[PDB]
Write a protein that binds this DNA or RNA. Structure first.
Ligand SMILES: [Mg+2]
Ligand SMILES: [Mg+2]
Ligand SMILES: [Mg+2]
Ligand SMILES: [Mg+2]
Ligand SMILES: [Mg+2]
Ligand SMILES: [Mg+2]
Ligand SMILES: [Mg+2]
Ligand SMILES: [Mg+2]
Ligand SMILES: [Mg+2]
Ligand SMILES: [Mg+2]
Ligand SMILES: [Mg+2]
Ligand SMILES: [Mg+2]
Ligand SMILES: [Mg+2]
Ligand SMILES: [Mg+2]
Ligand SMILES: [Mg+2]
Ligand SMILES: [Mg+2]
Ligand SMILES: [Mg+2]
Ligand SMILES: [Mg+2]
Ligand SMILES: [Mg+2]
Ligand SMILES: [Mg+2]
Ligand SMILES: [Mg+2]
Ligand SMILES: [Mg+2]
Ligand SMILES: [Mg+2]
Ligand SMILES: [Mg+2]
Ligand SMILES: [Mg+2]
Ligand SMILES: [Mg+2]
Ligand SMILES: [Mg+2]
Ligand SMILES: [Mg+2]
Ligand SMILES: [Mg+2]
Ligand SMILES: [Mg+2]
Ligand SMILES: [Mg+2]
Ligand SMILES: [Mg+2]
Ligand SMILES: [Mg+2]
Ligand SMILES: [Mg+2]
Ligand SMILES: [Mg+2]
Ligand SMILES: [Mg+2]
Ligand SMILES: [Mg+2]
Ligand SMILES: [Mg+2]
Ligand SMILES: [Mg+2]
Ligand SMILES: [Mg+2]
Ligand SMILES: [Mg+2]
Ligand SMILES: [Mg+2]
Ligand SMILES: [Mg+2]
Ligand SMILES: [Mg+2]
Ligand SMILES: [Mg+2]
Ligand SMILES: [Mg+2]
Ligand SMILES: [Mg+2]
Ligand SMILES: [Mg+2]
Ligand SMILES: [Mg+2]
Ligand SMILES: [Mg+2]
Ligand SMILES: [Mg+2]
Ligand SMILES: [Mg+2]
Ligand SMILES: [Mg+2]
Ligand SMILES: [Mg+2]
Ligand SMILES: [Mg+2]
Ligand SMILES: [Mg+2]
Ligand SMILES: [Mg+2]
Lengths: 118, 143, 49, 112, 101
RNA sequence: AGGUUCGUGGUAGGAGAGCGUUCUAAGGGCGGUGAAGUCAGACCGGAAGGACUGGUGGAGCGCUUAGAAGUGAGAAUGCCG
RNA sequence: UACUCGGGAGUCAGACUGCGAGUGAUAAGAUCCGUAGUCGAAAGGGAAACAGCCCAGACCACCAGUUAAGGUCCCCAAAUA
RNA sequence: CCGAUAGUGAACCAGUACCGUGAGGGAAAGGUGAAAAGCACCCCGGAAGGGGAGUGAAACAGUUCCUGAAACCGUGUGCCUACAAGUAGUUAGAGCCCGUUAAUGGGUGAUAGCGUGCCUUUUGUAGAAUGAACCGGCGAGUUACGAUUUGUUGCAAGGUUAA
């Protein structure tokens, strides 16, 4: 028995086009071009889930550094004091105090100076 | 999740006066290029302008160690065939001290659309008097 | 026998393998034939001996 | 009740791009002024758009009882129609396609 | 007051009444979950742990056990006829903070 | 059915488990209180994919267990419109 | 892990780098062998960019941590140690 | 077994139209509605074509007339755009506008980081090597008879029929 193609080809192609909504020009209209853009967007999105974790950690470091310099310290010589004193607060929380609740950041920095001296 | 991002106009931008007599050309420019960027504030945000305004006076007394006053050359090309022109750093300091410090700093700033914005934040005067006394700047001591 | 509930003996019937139906099946483009030989052509190969 | 009237001209023998260049003049103007505009524009699509705009006015007052003195033109567009395909004999035994394109013209008038 | 607790391999800054999302935990809806790994307590004072603040705990209550939105992990290598598709839905636990001790 | 240890880049290629399409047999179904088709959505599964609701359409079509294949297209200076 | 028997293949254009030789001029990103690595079939970080060099092998998610080669004045994270 | 690119070249005035001096080659083209009840009549116009009225369950079924996708061409509008160097995206993200199969929702996105299309053939291709104007349909490991090996079933020193 013959099996004529129908309702199956356009169903799969239309699904790919709708995934290319908002692209400039024909990239949101034509299947051949939109297929290459949807494949490429996935490859980008896959490797920015890796870069996103690197990009933020560089942001927290640059904010702890700026706040630490106001107390006659630097990032390299502050993060050594905390480890040598036993405090295990990570960068994300440390940067949060430096912006919102700078009062407590100084209390942590004072303990860092005590560890360095003794 | 929850990481603070600044907004345009949320951070107060100050004015600073920097005296540039005797300091090396590249040692001064390096510190100024981070004041305009905003890298001295915990409110730092990479995609938002959050720096300070800087006024530089005594631009004619800048330092040039070694034989830089004669052996350092600044090139310009006008895109016409054989249109390369050059000036030494020594006579540039004598005649146009404001251009020497702007060229040095402009290469120390990001080369993007926001990097041009920070450039317009810099005023250089070859003498010892500035026209921005209405903004009430402060004296910033270089580290 | 309830012709609506036929179940043949397990392992007595397998499924045909069809080559040249996309690269997800492992037998796509070249269909298990390699690259550009005499054995890779229609009606190729040499005699038995 | 009825606030606007329309008229169309199906399959007029003028290319859509040539008639679309005169429609842009009369969009948003009063019917009294728009009729004069098509009178003094020396294009070939003026006698056709003029004859459609007048028809829309006519049934705007006979069918719906509006005012000829208080009408504007709010909708005016040109659509494509069934093109005719011909040929033109070129040099060295070849032939070249010629498209004789038609158009649909719509004008909508309403009170303001 | 606020506290910094560690849960799910990462730390979160928490406040009484705040409603957070963490990794999957144990317990049906309505159970009271106690966190015993607290690193810092602030507010009108300060209590820094070395590394943990001794005796302090945070009490919460689960509200929903579910999964996040559907991702679609996709990979391919040009000119080599290699593609791979896979969907993902990460489980989570939703909490409301009752009190901080 | 549950544990422990070791693993899970991949072209040619080998092995396995599957989705979907047309038709046939049996069971059991829906449909002029609206079938297939078609258009739009922010739903579901590990993938191929599968539902739901609303508009148009105006008479046929699914589900379960097996069987058989004119069985899935983005490329051939591919054929036709 | 080997070995034996049986079903199914693909491959026989290789490339560069370190070491030992031939031809060449003790030239070639040359040509031809032996030996190890990588690419082919390998993404990630460093060499500005840069298949073959240095570190190192991606099952998926995380706005968590410690390190390798390479680095810490600004572009650009970290010593104007 | 096919269901209008399928099945005869030909479902329709087909070996016809068309091409060739001739032998000869050789197409495209199905569907209103149950019933023509196929739009008396009025208005614009030379006409075509429209707007009401009427028939009909339906006229967005009006003499290529069931359904009517995509390329392609237009009208209106929410967000952005005239100092900017762009495989056109992805990640971070303010502002403005909405309100769903209700869930760590939708549209557009100033600015910042990263980022040289798909296939083929190659030691090696973003490649200045090859193919594709775009959309749609059609388009490539099958069958018969034998050989060998694995799996399942019946019987077993027996097994099995062909015409
Ligand atoms: Mg059929
Ligand atoms: Mg097809
Ligand atoms: Mg967009
Ligand atoms: Mg199989
Ligand atoms: Mg393979
Ligand atoms: Mg292929
Ligand atoms: Mg080939
Ligand atoms: Mg071969
Ligand atoms: Mg000719
Ligand atoms: Mg002639
Ligand atoms: Mg594998
Ligand atoms: Mg196989
Ligand atoms: Mg039935
Ligand atoms: Mg059917
Ligand atoms: Mg429907
Ligand atoms: Mg199904
Ligand atoms: Mg079906
Ligand atoms: Mg086929
Ligand atoms: Mg064509
Ligand atoms: Mg073998
Ligand atoms: Mg040989
Ligand atoms: Mg050889
Ligand atoms: Mg060799
Ligand atoms: Mg050599
Ligand atoms: Mg060589
Ligand atoms: Mg050679
Ligand atoms: Mg290897
Ligand atoms: Mg190869
Ligand atoms: Mg690599
Ligand atoms: Mg690399
Ligand atoms: Mg180099
Ligand atoms: Mg790099
Ligand atoms: Mg490659
Ligand atoms: Mg691995
Ligand atoms: Mg470290
Ligand atoms: Mg830095
Ligand atoms: Mg036919
Ligand atoms: Mg049809
Ligand atoms: Mg004749
Ligand atoms: Mg009929
Ligand atoms: Mg009429
Ligand atoms: Mg008349
Ligand atoms: Mg008439
Ligand atoms: Mg009517
Ligand atoms: Mg009626
Ligand atoms: Mg109807
Ligand atoms: Mg009806
Ligand atoms: Mg019918
Ligand atoms: Mg129709
Ligand atoms: Mg359309
Ligand atoms: Mg602008
Ligand atoms: Mg709804
Ligand atoms: Mg960008
Ligand atoms: Mg070559
Ligand atoms: Mg070729
Ligand atoms: Mg071409
Ligand atoms: Mg095509």
């Amino acid at each position: 028995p013959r099996v004529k193609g129908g309702t199956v080809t356009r169903k799969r192609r239309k699904k790919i086009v709708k995934l290319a909504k908002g692209y400039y020009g024909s990239k949101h209209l034509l299947f051949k071009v939109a297929n290459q853009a949807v494949m490429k967007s996935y490859q980008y999105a896959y490797r920015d889930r890796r870069q996103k974790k690197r990009d933020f950690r560089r942001l927290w470091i640059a904010r702890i550094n700026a706040a630490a310099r106001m107390q006659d310290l630097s990032y390299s010589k502050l993060m050594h004091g905390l480890k040598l004193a036993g405090i295990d607060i990570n960068r994300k929380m440390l940067a949060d105090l430096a912006v919102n609740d700078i009062a407590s950041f100084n209390t942590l920095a004072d303990s860092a100076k005590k560890a360095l001296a003794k | 999740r929850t990481t603070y991002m600044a907004k345009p106009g949320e951070v107060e931008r100050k004015w600073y006066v920097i005296d540039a007599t005797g300091v090396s050309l590249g040692r001064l420019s390096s510190e100024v290029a981070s004041i305009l960027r905003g890298k001295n504030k915990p409110q730092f945000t990479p995609h938002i302008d959050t720096g300070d305004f800087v006024i530089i006076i005594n631009a004619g007394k800048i330092g040039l160690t070694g034989k830089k006053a004669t052996d350092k050359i600044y090139y310009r090309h006008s895109q016409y065939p054989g249109g390369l022109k050059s000036r030494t750093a020594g006579e540039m300091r004598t005649n146009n001290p404001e251009k020497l410090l702007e060229l040095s700093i402009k290469g120390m700033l990001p080369k993007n659309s926001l990097g041009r914005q920070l450039f317009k934040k810099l005023h250089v005067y070859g003498g010892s008097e500035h026209e921005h006394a209405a903004q009430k700047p402060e004296v910033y001591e270089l580290r | 026998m309830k012709l609506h509930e036929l179940k043949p003996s397990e392992g007595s019937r397998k499924e045909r393998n069809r080559v040249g139906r996309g690269t997800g099946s492992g037998n796509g483009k070249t269909s298990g034939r390699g690259h550009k030989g005499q054995k890779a052509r229609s009606g190729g190969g040499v005699r038995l001996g | 009740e009825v606030t606007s009237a329309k008229a169309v001209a199906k399959t007029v023998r003028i290319a859509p791009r040539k008639a679309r260049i005169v429609i842009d003049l009369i969009r948003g103007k009063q019917v009294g002024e728009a009729i004069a505009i098509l009178k003094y524009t020396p294009r070939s699509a003026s006698p056709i758009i003029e004859k459609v705009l007048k028809s829309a006015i006519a049934n705007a007052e006979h069918n719906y009882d509006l005012d000829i003195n208080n009408l504007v033109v709010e909708e005016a567009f040109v659509d494509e129609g069934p093109t005719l395909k011909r040929f033109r004999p070129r040099a060295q035994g070849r032939a070249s396609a010629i498209n004789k394109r038609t158009s649909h013209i719509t004008v909508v008038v309403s009170e303001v | 007051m606020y506290a910094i607790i560690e849960t799910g391999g990462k730390q979160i800054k928490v406040e009484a009444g705040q409603e957070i999302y963490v990794e999957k935990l144990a317990g049906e809806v309505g159970d009271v979950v106690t966190f015993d790994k607290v690193l810092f307590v602030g507010g009108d004072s300060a209590k820094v742990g070395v590394p943990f603040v001794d005796g302090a705990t945070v009490t919460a209550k689960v509200e929903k056990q579910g999964r996040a939105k559907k991702l679609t992990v996709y990979k391919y290598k040009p000119k080599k006829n290699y593609h791979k598709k896979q969907g993902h839905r990460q489980p989570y636990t939703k909490l409301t903070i009752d009190a901080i001790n």
